[model samples]
Structures are given as structure tokens and as C-alpha cells.
Target: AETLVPLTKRVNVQADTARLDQIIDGCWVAVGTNKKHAIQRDFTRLFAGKPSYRFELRKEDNTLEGYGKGETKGRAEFSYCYATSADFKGLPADAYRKAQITKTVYHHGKGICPQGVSRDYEFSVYIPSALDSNVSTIFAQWHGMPDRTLVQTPEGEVKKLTVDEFLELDKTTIFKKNTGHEKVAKLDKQGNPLKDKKGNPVYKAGKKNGWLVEQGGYPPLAFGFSGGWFYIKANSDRRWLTDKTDRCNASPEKTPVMKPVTSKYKSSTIAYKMPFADFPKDCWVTFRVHIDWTTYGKEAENIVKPGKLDVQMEYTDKKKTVKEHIVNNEVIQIGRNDDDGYYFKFGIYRVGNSTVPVCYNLAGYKEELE
Candidate 1:
């Protein structure tokens, strides 16, 4: 008989009494146009608390519910959730290389899904059972990487941007400085102003700490979903699907571009698509994602490495199962700063003027060992 061992520990919220924060202890809820900043959320407003119409957790039925209030219209945006705690940052880099991560999702509401606001969760809604609106959709997951360009200050010191400081790039204020070529009073070696021949203090023609200037590019390394990467789609607007335009760096920097592989299971080893046109409510949707980092390329100087992602999906409504094996053909650069590991994230993250709600349950992770 073969013995089974657990890889990723499970975080459960089945008592219906668990606080939102407690349920997702190490996770952060990011909101905004670019998901650069993390904001405070009314957990009670969406959990088993007030508002009554937003979200609710029903332990009796083993289901956690969520919905949009449709208040901010195009401005209302949320990053859903991300788990990049100290233990699980990027994909398991060692013993747990080949692991299985699963999650059961249910579409509570019908009709078009909402548009996304930023790069974190881009929108691609498909209406099943009716010809509602076929908004060209693209499914992509942003991963936090370990490599980042460190800012070298005039003082010869390096610094990293905080989550808030990093997101400031969206507004172009992360590197603003006073660069006026004006002179100020000069100081002497003894903490006193330097005096000229007649008694007037000497003046220095330069800004204070002038070396502290902006580098004029994306902010220094920060945090994001560094765990791994994924993309699923069933539309024709492939403009930014796997193009460089969908990445964080807009410069001439080369990013990893993989020649995706298709599987007989209707699953592309790299990208997995769900035919939402036939999706139904109440039916359970399961995603079993497997990532193998051992096959990733060996570390090279001044370059990001590579990894492979495999996924399998079970659709009860369609009574079928699909799986794929996709490899990272290029240098895969995810996240900003280097952390430890990565975690799972889920929720209805969208933008534009619309309402969308998603319910998920029976979610956890597992590991396969020889």
C-alpha cells in the first residue's frame, strides 16, 4: 500500500463563525485601477454580516457566497485575494515540486461578467444559454517574481519600495522630487553655518539630498502573486493575450513568451479555457492545477528563469474532464521583490459599469511524492 502525504496545508472556514480576516489570515485585499495599492474592505459587508445582499457564508450548506453592490460603477475594483506569506511565496522550488492545487467554483449569477480594471484580473465574460453579450475575454493570472532592478542612490545605497510606494507608479508620483537648481545656506564641519570673509554664511548651489531622485521607470521591487502564472481563454481578441503589451515592464526588456502546447483533454498545458457558453449555476466546477518547478531552467546571471504549469478541470454540468501540460519557454519574471512562497487567490475582480458575483467552496491544496 502507498502512503499519502499532504503538501500545502489547508485553511478552512467552514464553521460560519470565522472572521473574514481570520479565514484569510495571511492574505491581503488589494483594490484600485492597477492593484498596486492595498485597501481596507468592509469584510462584514461582504461576509456573513450586514448588507444582506452583498455576500454571505452558509456553513450548513458548505457554501461561501459573494456579490457586487454595483456602487462605484467603473471605479469599483478589487484584487480579490493573494497569499504570498513567508512559507509559500513562489511555486514549491524543492521537494514539493510536483503538487496539486484544487478549488471548486460555482457561478451563482448568470449573464455577462464585469470588465476588469487593471492587470491583476483582466475581464472576459461569456454568457451561457443565451446570446447576451460576447465581450472578447482573456484569462490571465499575474505572478510575483524574485528579480527586480534595485535603485542605486547617489549615496551608494539601495532601497526597495513598499506596497504603497510601488503602486504610486500608477499615478507617476513614486519618483517625483524637487530638482530646482537653487542655492541654500552652507553648513560648516561643526554643525554651524559657514561664514564668508565678512560674516555672511556661505551658500551651496544645490537641492538638499539631491541624490534622492526618481529613476523614472517602474517602481523598485514590491510584492504580488509570485506563486505562478496561468491564462485561459475562448475568444478572438488575442491582442494582448500573450503579447508583451500585457506585462508590467513596457520598455524594450525581453519577457518570457512560450509556444503553448495543446492536449487531447481540450486543455492546453499552458492555458486552459472553459466553454462558459454552456456553463450552468448550482453545478460544481473543480480546477486541479499542477506546477513543476524542478524542470525550470537553471539560474543564469542577470536573467529570469523558467517553470512549467499543468492543469486539470472537472465540469459536472458538461460531465467531462480536461487536463493540460504547459511549459514556460522563456524567462518568466513574476512579482517585484524576492519573498518566500506563493498562495492561492480568488473572487470577482472586475472594472467598468457592471455587477458580477462568484461563490467558491471545498478549496485546498495537495502534494504528490514518490
Candidate 2:
């Protein structure tokens, strides 16, 4: 029998408890929105603890109604993360939303893994019976942190915007809208972009930080289920110029395009689609991401070397037997910054206003690294 083994000790970050401090395994796990009520660690008595963690976005209920109407709180999410690689002891947990989260002594730059590490995550999710059919949003995703070494002075030059601040800029039309395909900028009358004196795209400048670390962009990898079809989308860009002295000069350049892949690769890969009528949901579907990461830096610009992403999906059929759709060794780009801070986030993250109120359940989370 072929068996797989985990090199590092296993950690369980499941919501098996009511309190926030207890659930945060280590790194800061940012939770809630303006309406904290939208998140129910205990939704119902039956599926409250251990297994069911409920997240509702743009929900139509009395309390959660219009919850997703905010600029930054467009979705309800639990971000399992931290921008720096700090030994988070005695760090105030409740103040995760404040500047202190980034103002701490160790708030230097680092990737999810400094060099590159293989990691695996397991989660079980439940689709609702009356779930909206023709809707799409990111249920879970993994994102890269900016290359910190590139920042001359992190606190002074790395003006990273908060989730709320980023959203407000977009709602007011201050920043340009873009998919991971391009950077944010002002558009010209002909729909082209305006550039700075140096012939580079000009973005909103920061007061303290000479340049800004724009937070909006596609992740290295994300799992979004759309219209009952489970899909995966990815984006990997070579920082247009990982300017070591990323001064206010050009506002940090990033390639306006995603990495070019083989003919076999696609922007979105559909694992399998559950028909709309099969809303007879209740079974806990399992999802696992096993990834061996690639490196970042000058060499990352060209795909001379590539990493691999292995996805495993388990579902229970009517016969009560469990089956799996396992796709392994998928050639892909998994790096962004040489000093990495890749992290995980989940919930209903829809860029556009909601077409329908959405709710979902998640259970049994585990992360193992090598």
C-alpha cells in the first residue's frame, strides 16, 4: 500500500471552540466584518461547535441584511494570516485589525516560507440545499505578501492598506479596477492608462510610505465555486521590477500579465459540476491542497523552473461511498515575493455586488508543513 507522510507536526485550526483566542492556532487569524453578527461560530445548537462554522455575506436576514454593502466588507471572511514572520507571543489578539498588527517589532518582510516549503491543508465544507445556483465567489484562497526586502524602510515605505481602506478607494473610483491581469491606474480617454514622467503607470501616492503596496490583485491560487461548479484560478506575476530601492519613484512595478503556461494550462480549471437540482446537500465534502512551492526573484520572471499543485476532492455519493477527484502534479507558478508571506483566506468574497445572498459551512481544518 502506498502511504503519504507529513514531515512536520500536524496543527488543527478548526473552530471547535467559541472564543477567538482559542481558535487562532498561531499566526493572526483575522475574522469578522463591520457586522460581526454575520459570522456565527455557533449557528445552531445542532451544528454549532467543532464542525459548523457559518459565514454569511450579503445575507437577507434581519441582522445580517445588507452586511456586504460596505466598501471593504463586501464579503465575510476569516483570514488565517500575518504579513511578517514574527514569533507571535503576547501579541494582542483582538487588535488584529489595528495598525499594531503591522507595527510590531518583527513586522519585517518574509514569505509564507522564507525559502520555499511544501505544505498541505485539509478542509471540509458543506453546500446549502437552497444555495444560489448561478453565483460565483472565492470560498478559499492563498495569496502572496509583497517582497519586503524590496522595501527600503518597511514602516516608512511599505504603506500597506487595510482591507477597509482598499475597498473604499475602489468604491469612490479613486483607483483603477483590474483583474490579476494588470496593475491599478487611471485610464485615458481611449481606455489606455496614464503614466508617470518615467513612462510608468502612476498610482495614488502614500503620505508616509513614498510608494504604496497595492493589496488588490489575484492570489497565487484560489478556490472559487461558481454556479455549482468547483473551480480553481491562479495568477503569478513577476514584479514588473522588484526595485530594491522601491522608492516613491515608480510606485513599484509589476508585470501587467500573468505567467505564460503550456497549452495544457487554463486560467480556470473546473474539477466537476454538481447539477443545480442536486441541492440535496448535507454531506461534508473534503478538499485538500498539497503544494510544493516555487521560488521568487529575478529568475521567477521566466518559468525556467516551476512548482506543482496537487488538489484532492472527496465527496460522498448516494450509495454512502466516498469517492475522490484527485489531480496531482499540476505544473504552475506559486511564487510572488522573494521574501514570502503567502496566507489563506475563506468565505464569500465576490468582487461584484451580490446577485443573491450567500451562506456556507466549514469544518475540520488542518495544516501540515514540511
Best by lDDT: 2
Candidate 2 is scored at a TM of 0.59
Q: lDDT tens string, model 2, 1-370? A: 2122111121122211213342333433444443544555533412324435566666442222231345232456665643332433355674333332222222332214443677888777777776777555667877665532122223344333454564443332321111112224667889887988999875542223223333334466766555544455555555522432221110001211223331222122232234445533666677888876665544344443556777777777678656555455677666554354466777666533444667777666667764
Q: How high is each candidate's TM-score?
A: 0.34, 0.59
lDDT, candidate 1, 1-370, per-residue tens: 2122111122221101112343232332322222211112222222223111111111122121212243332111122232223223353463122111011010111111112111111111111232222221112233222212223344645454453453342232222221212446678788888889999866555543322322111211111111121233111111111111222221111222332222211111223322334333333334444332211111221213333343344444455553323222222222121221222233222222223322222222222320
Please give the range of 10 consecutive residues that has the lowest summed lDDT in model 1: 100-109
lDDT of each: 0.25, 0.48
Regions more than 4 Å wrong, model 2: 1-28, 43-49, 59-73, 83-111, 148-214, 240-280
